[PDB]
Design a binder for this molecule. Structure first.
Ligand code: CLA
Ligand code: CLA
Ligand code: CLA
Ligand code: CLA
Ligand code: CLA
Ligand SMILES: CCCCCCCCCCCCCCCC(=O)OC[C@H](COP(=O)(O)OC[C@@H](O)CO)OC(=O)CCCCCCCCCCCCCCC
Ligand code: KC2
Ligand code: KC2
Ligand SMILES: CC1=C(C#C/C(C)=C/C=C/C(C)=C/C=C/C=C(C)/C=C/C=C(\C)C#CC2=C(C)C[C@@H](O)CC2(C)C)C(C)(C)C[C@H](O)C1
Ligand SMILES: CC1=C(C#C/C(C)=C/C=C/C(C)=C/C=C/C=C(C)/C=C/C=C(C)/C=C/C2=C(C)CCCC2(C)C)C(C)(C)C[C@H](O)C1
Ligand SMILES: CC1=CCCC(C)(C)[C@H]1/C=C/C(C)=C/C=C/C(C)=C/C=C/C=C(C)/C=C/C=C(C)/C=C/C1=C(C)CCCC1(C)C
Ligand SMILES: CC1=CCCC(C)(C)[C@H]1/C=C/C(C)=C/C=C/C(C)=C/C=C/C=C(C)/C=C/C=C(C)/C=C/C1=C(C)CCCC1(C)C
Ligand SMILES: [Mn+2]
Lengths: 173, 49, 180, 57, 45, 35, 163, 163
């Protein structure tokens, strides 16, 4: 019983400390049923989408462009579904995911770390220690934003108020 | 007028084609497609007439 | 090892540094399953046609022939304004040019049977291929212009279809798409 | 006289080691590989059998 | 009029299809030996 | 009626072209006595 | 020091954050730099002068006019067409000179042989004047850009801001 | 074998098929099948045809009160004459059926099919290495069919005079 995060559940068989953020948290059987590389790739993609979504949820409420009407983010999804901008965003996300398919195929073969697209224009994470610290921060922020975006969306669906609009004048249910 | 013009075109086209066939040899697509014998030429003339 | 175009995807097996315009960009294994000479010939043909098409898109807006029916600013509408007999004459002339250039070898099995290099149709009135480094840089420039012209012709043609306006004409009085 | 002059040759301002410059001009790889029909079948397998779902195994 | 062609679009099948097949025929024609044979018919195929 | 006409023209042109280029493909050589 | 940037060229202080000299021939870069600098010297001088003299008959032709508006009126008049065609005629032989320089010749970037006053007789004077020309040309580029964008924001010439 | 077109030619002129196709069959099979299905559909359910062109239609279909003996595909309307009358040359499908257009369709496709049958008999005789004059024998019923279906309407000036 040495899972190191849940003391009574033991370390999972393939959850060695090779991966960043590996605290042994896998109570249900998922790493023993699916490839860990694919799981890490899916985790990073979900978390990056969630981080961008949380930042967008803040910014769109705080400021919307001179163009487009003043809308809440969910109403924004509906309006851009009916307008055509959502189709453009879906088209370009699908275009990037077309090569993401090949990247995941490589990850299945090897020669590519899960979630590694070699995207680093500003030249950050110089030296390995800084890279490991940034990896840990990235994974933690990814999971936190994965929880937070669902929190934002379900709270808007329940209270009919946006997040910072809800922070003041809470109006408890 | 149409008859005379068409016969002008036919005469000049026949002269040009005659000079062509005098100065040329059948092409590869024509050589492999036709039978080259007297009876074959006779049959071609027969269907034409 | 790596592609250097997409540094997360590794270099394609058939994309060595020998061919011009090779930055390792082949995410889908087209070079693995198709002949590179045929692919390069098709790329160069598409791009040269697109370079001529972009030049025509600009020129026909700028200058028109005084023949009747040849006075359409919009190139897409100019295709249908021009008599169809002339367009078919153009098509037959281009087909004759293609057949003469390839010498009857119009298939990937026989087009490069004699070699002839991909995209080398023997058109070089000025001997600008004498220097090898100059020839390689000219090949890279030709490929870059070909790809840029393909993208630009696609954009100009679709924007002409939407706005019914010639490209330089459409640049002024922009009138976003929802206006039409 | 057909531009057969030692000084007659093209010039480009780009460096010869710029990315995208081929090692040899007019490359003609042999391509001892799959036939055209196999390539067309591969392009069709792009749309009826993509590697999307084999990752979740 | 002409070949029953009262609409210009009718010219598209009448040209593209004969050309395309011809292109296929070209792959045949380039394969065959196109030298003279001096015979009633060419047995080389 | 135009779509039916274009379909018929396409079909007839295809079959006539197949016939014409098939009899151009050295049809005389397709005999059992050919060596 | 940046790669591909040797000290054989005047005005070199090893200033190249972006490797333009590593992907483009330095002869072409120096020729382009000198041409841009000379064009900018002439342009800045003209933009300053056009706020003062305006020539005898230009006033009733173009009205008042200024900078971009002056370009817009002059392209409609015909002066811009004449200047464009004649400078293009000159730039044809400029292109020939650039091609011959890249092919290998005694020519150097910016050496058009235009020394009517024989000011290049002293070699050290010419060596100093090359750096003088480079720095005044770079200053002229910066100044012409400044005048253009100041006219964009306010619609005033270089002297209307001073006076 | 050598090329795709060569493989297609080998399959077309193959003697291993249950029914020989050949190049003449390439034209014969579509025309004969089209004429056959159109004839069956017309014999079963065609509307009555104004053969005499004086607005009194004549029924020849099974669904309109005919048996096998009395059923027929009525010749084209006398107003049509020997004008080419395809489906696309009629204002409506009802108008095409009313003027005896299916008769022209069946007759033309059947004549093309029997010409293809003559050629295909010759073609398979050549493929088998036998003598080719069975098609010469078959020309006689083809001649009779063309005389009663095409030549007589041409001489009389109307497809309504055809059998
Ligand atoms: C260069 C590539 C390209 C091109 C040609 C277009 C073209 C277009 N986009 Mg798209 N788009 C692109 C890349 C591109 N997009 C990318 C990379 C993104 C980010 C993922 C988007 C995100 C996007 C959104 C969200 C929207 C568009 C919209 C539009 C349309 C706006 C046209 C207009 O009114 O004038 C635009 C004029 C200017 C921008 C002034 C200069 C047009 C069809 C809009 C649309 O569909 O409107 C109906 C819309 O709402 N685009
Ligand atoms: C009695 C006259 C006669 C004869 C027997 C020939 C015989 C020949 N010629 Mg020559 N020729 C002639 C007149 C003649 N020619 C004339 C007058 C011209 C000038 C135009 C030519 C120009 C000419 C050229 C340029 C070529 C030949 C070639 C050939 C050979 C193959 C032809 C072939 O396959 O036809 C092919 C037939 C067709 C593809 C059909 C075309 C029909 C056109 C489109 C008109 C259609 C009219 C109508 C709608 C359909 C017919 C209706 C009918 C009832 C009248 C063959 C040895 C070829 C060869 O190998 O020689 C080097 C070749 O390249 N001929
Ligand atoms: C993809 C290429 C392309 C295509 C499909 C067309 C198609 C068309 N053009 Mg455009 N055109 C093109 C390129 C093209 N053009 C270029 C490159 C130019 C610049 C010279 C022009 C200038 C032009 C004018 C000025 C006009 C047209 C017009 C037309 C229409 C009638 C055809 C005609 O008269 O052509 C005329 C075109 C030419 C005489 C130019 C052909 C030059 C070729 C493409 C370049 C070959 C150079 C090459 C090095 C030589 C190799 C030798 C071996 C038709 C829709 C007419 C129209 O209706 O417009 C509204 C018209 O008035 N074209
Ligand atoms: C008599 C006319 C004629 C003839 C015989 C030829 C003969 C030839 N041409 Mg063509 N050509 C002609 C006229 C002609 N040309 C004209 C007038 C033009 C316009 C200026 C072209 C433009 C052209 C191009 C652009 C290309 C050729 C090519 C070829 C060669 C291969 C032919 C082949 O296999 O294609 C048979 C026909 C096909 C295979 C069908 C075309 C394929 C479709 C259009 C691709 C569609 C892709 C799709 C839209 C993208 C997917 C989108 C995604 C969202 C799913 C051959 C020598 C090709 C070549 O040399 O390859 C190396 C080539 O790339 N030609
Ligand atoms: C990049 C250089 C450049 C450009 C594009 C222009 C463009 C223009 N000028 Mg400006 N100008 C320039 C340089 C330039 N000028 C210089 C260097 C001077 C100082 C002499 C002037 C003085 C000047 C005046 C006083 C006027 C213009 C005017 C004009 C306009 C009409 C052209 C004309 O008649 O000018 C004529 C310009 C000249 C004769 C100057 C040519 C001097 C050359 C560069 C000497 C080259 C050295 C030579 C080898 C040694 C001898 C036009 C917008 C007119 C206008 O519309 O303004 C209201 C006008 O009235 N310009
Ligand atoms: C309905 C469809 C109707 C089609 C009518 C076909 C007529 C014959 C076409 C064969 C055309 C064909 O594919 O054969 C082409 C024949 C063989 O072609 P290859 O593939 O060997 O190429 C050799 C090169 O010379 C290019 O032809 O070339 C020659 O015989 C010499 C050049 C004659 C070129 C043709 C001139 C006369 C063509 C008349 C049209
Ligand atoms: C570069 C491709 C090309 C070539 C190689 C080429 C060669 C020849 C030759 C052989 C040497 C002759 C004899 C010839 C004759 C005519 N051509 Mg020409 N021609 C070419 C291109 C075009 C276009 C684009 C048009 C055109 C026209 C005409 C008309 C006018 C008919 C009329 O008077 O109405 C006539 C008589 C126009 C057209 O047919 O309009 C209905 C028109 O748009 N052509 N053409
Ligand atoms: C070489 C020095 C010089 C230059 C570089 C130059 C450039 C331009 C441009 C260039 C953009 C325009 C557009 C322009 C226009 C006119 N010039 Mg001018 N011009 C120059 C010199 C002279 C002289 C010596 C005279 C003169 C005149 C006129 C008149 C007359 C009718 C009018 O006033 O309505 C008009 C329209 C005459 C005059 O009557 O001046 C009041 C006259 O004597 N210019 N001028
Ligand atoms: C080979 C050969 C030789 C030769 C030669 C030749 C004939 C050379 C000719 C070369 C040509 C004509 C190249 C043309 C390229 C055109 C391009 C790249 C257009 C791009 C358009 C774009 C990017 C766009 C756009 C647009 C979009 C999309 C929408 C708009 O809202 C905006 C905008 C307008 C910007 C010669 C004889 C010299 C010598 C030799 O011995 C052999
Ligand atoms: C459908 C719809 C759309 C949509 C949409 C979208 C994006 C829907 C997505 C909703 C999401 C992402 C919900 C997330 C739920 C996550 C939960 C409950 C986990 C919490 C964490 C826990 C419990 C942690 C527990 C833990 C803690 C620390 C301690 C114990 C251990 C541990 C287990 C780790 C639109 C908006 C586009 C509009 C359209 O018209 C329709
Ligand atoms: C290639 C090929 C295919 C496969 C089979 C094959 C055997 C291997 C071969 C077959 C080849 C075949 C079957 C080739 C046969 C092809 C044929 C039959 C060609 C007919 C040509 C007739 C023309 C152009 C008429 C011109 C009349 C004019 C100008 C009249 C003018 C008139 C005048 C004088 C008087 C006034 C009226 C007007 C109208 C004005
Ligand atoms: C209708 C009509 C008009 C006239 C009559 C007609 C002739 C019969 C007919 C014409 C029909 C014709 C000729 C129609 C021709 C239509 C054409 C040419 C369509 C081409 C579109 C090009 C595209 C979408 C390329 C996009 C490039 C991208 C996304 C680049 C991506 C990039 C890559 C991968 C690299 C990384 C960076 C980024 C930027 C991300
Ligand atoms: Mn009668």
């Amino acid at each position: 019983d040495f899972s190191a995060a849940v003391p009574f559940l033991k370390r999972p068989s393939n959850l060695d400390g090779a991966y960043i953020g590996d605290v042994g948290f896998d109570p249900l059987g998922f790493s023993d049923v699916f490839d860990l590389r694919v799981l890490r790739e899916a985790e990073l993609k979900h978390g990056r989408f969630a981080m961008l979504a949380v930042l967008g949820f803040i910014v769109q409420e705080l400021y919307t462009f001179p163009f487009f009407p003043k809308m809440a983010p969910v109403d924004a999804h509906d309006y851009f579904v009916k307008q055509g901008g959502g189709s453009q965003i879906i088209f370009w996300i699908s275009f990037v995911e077309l090569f993401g398919v090949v990247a995941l195929f490589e990850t299945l073969q090897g020669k590519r770390e899960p979630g590694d697209f070699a995207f680093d224009p500003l030249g950050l994470a110089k030296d390995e220690a800084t890279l490991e610290r940034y990896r840990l921060a990235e994974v933690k922020h990814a999971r936190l934003a994965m929880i937070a975006i669902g929190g934002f969306i379900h709270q808007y669906w329940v209270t009919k108020q946006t997040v910072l609009e809800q922070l003041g004048n809470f109006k408890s249910l | 007028e149409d008859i005379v013009g068409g016969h002008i075109w036919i005469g000049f086209t026949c002269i040009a084609g005659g000079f062509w066939h005098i100065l040329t040899k059948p092409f590869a697509w024509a050589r492999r497609a036709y039978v080259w014998s007297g009876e074959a030429y006779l049959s071609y003339s027969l269907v034409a007439v | 090892d790596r592609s250097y175009s997409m540094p997360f995807l590794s270099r394609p097996p058939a994309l060595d540094g020998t061919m011009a315009g090779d930055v390792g960009f082949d995410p889908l294994g087209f070079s693995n399953y198709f002949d590179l000479k045929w692919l390069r010939e098709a790329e160069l043909k598409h791009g040269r046609i697109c370079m001529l098409g972009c030049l025509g898109f600009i020129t026909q807006e700028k200058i028109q022939l005084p023949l009747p029916g040849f006075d359409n600013k919009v190139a897409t509408e100019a295709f249908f304004s021009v008599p169809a007999g002339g367009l078919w004459q153009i098509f037959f002339t281009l087909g004759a040019i293609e057949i003469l250039s390839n010498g009857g070898k119009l298939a990937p099995a026989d087009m490069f049977a004699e070699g002839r290099a991909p995209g080398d149709l023997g058109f070089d009135p000025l001997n600008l291929s004498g220097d090898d480094a100059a020839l390689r840089r000219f090949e890279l420039a030709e490929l870059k212009h070909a790809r840029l012209a393909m993208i630009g012709l696609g954009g100009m043609l679709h924007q002409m279809l939407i706005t019914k306006q010639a490209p330089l004409e459409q640049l002024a009085n922009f009138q976003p798409i929802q206006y039409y | 006289a057909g531009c057969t002059t030692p000084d007659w040759f093209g010039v480009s301002q780009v460096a010869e080691d710029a990315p995208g410059v081929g090692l040899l001009a007019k490359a003609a790889p042999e391509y001892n590989g799959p036939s055209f029909r196999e390539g067309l079948e591969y392009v069709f397998s792009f749309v009826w059998k993509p590697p999307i779902l084999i990752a979740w195994k | 009029e002409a070949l029953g062609v009262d609409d210009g679009r009718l010219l598209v099948p009448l040209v593209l299809i004969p050309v395309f097949i011809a292109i296929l025929f070209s792959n045949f024609a380039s394969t065959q030996d196109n030298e003279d044979f001096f015979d009633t018919y060419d047995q080389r195929r | 009626m135009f779509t039916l006409k274009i379909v018929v023209y396409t079909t007839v042109t295809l079959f006539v072209s197949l016939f014409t280029f098939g009899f151009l493909s050295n049809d005389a050589s397709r005999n059992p006595n050919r060596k | 020091r940046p790669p591909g940037l040797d000290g054989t060229y005047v005005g070199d202080i090893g200033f190249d954050p972006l490797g333009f000299s590593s992907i483009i021939d330095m002869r072409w870069l120096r020729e382009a730099e000198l041409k841009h600098g000379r064009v900018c010297m002439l342009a800045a001088t003209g933009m300053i002068v056009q706020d003062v003299y305006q020539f005898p008959g230009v006033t009733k032709s173009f009205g008042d006019a200024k900078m971009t508006t002056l370009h817009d009126v002059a392209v409609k008049q015909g002066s811009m067409q004449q200047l464009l065609v004649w400078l293009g005629f000159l730039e044809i032989f400029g292109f020939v000179a650039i091609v011959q320089m890249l092919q290998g010749s005694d020519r150097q970037p910016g050496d058009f042989g235009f020394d009517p006053l024989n000011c290049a007789a002293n070699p050290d004077a010419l060596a100093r004047r090359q750096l003088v020309e480079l720095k005044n040309g770079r200053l002229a580029m910066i100044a012409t850009a400044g005048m253009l964008h100041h006219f964009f924001i306010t619609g005033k010439g270089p002297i209307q801001l001073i006076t | 074998s050598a090329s795709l077109w060569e493989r297609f030619c080998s399959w077309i002129t193959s003697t291993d098929n249950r029914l020989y196709i050949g190049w003449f069959g390439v034209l014969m099979i579509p025309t004969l099948l089209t004429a056959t299905t159109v004839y069956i559909i017309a014999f079963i359910a065609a509307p009555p045809v104004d053969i005499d062109g004086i607005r009194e239609p004549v029924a020849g279909s099974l669904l309109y009160g005919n048996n096998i003996i009395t059923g027929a595909v009525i010749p084209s309307s006398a107003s049509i004459g020997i004008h080419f009358y395809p489906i696309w040359e009629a204002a409506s499908l009802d108008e095409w059926l009313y003027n005896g257009g299916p008769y022209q369709l069946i007759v033309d496709h059947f004549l093309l099919g029997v010409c293809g049958w003559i050629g295909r008999e010759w073609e398979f005789s050549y493929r088998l290495g036998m003598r080719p004059w069975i098609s010469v024998a078959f020309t006689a019923p083809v001649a009779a069919a063309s005389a009663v279906f095409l030549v007589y309407p041409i001489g009389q000036g109307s497809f309504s005079d055809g059998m």
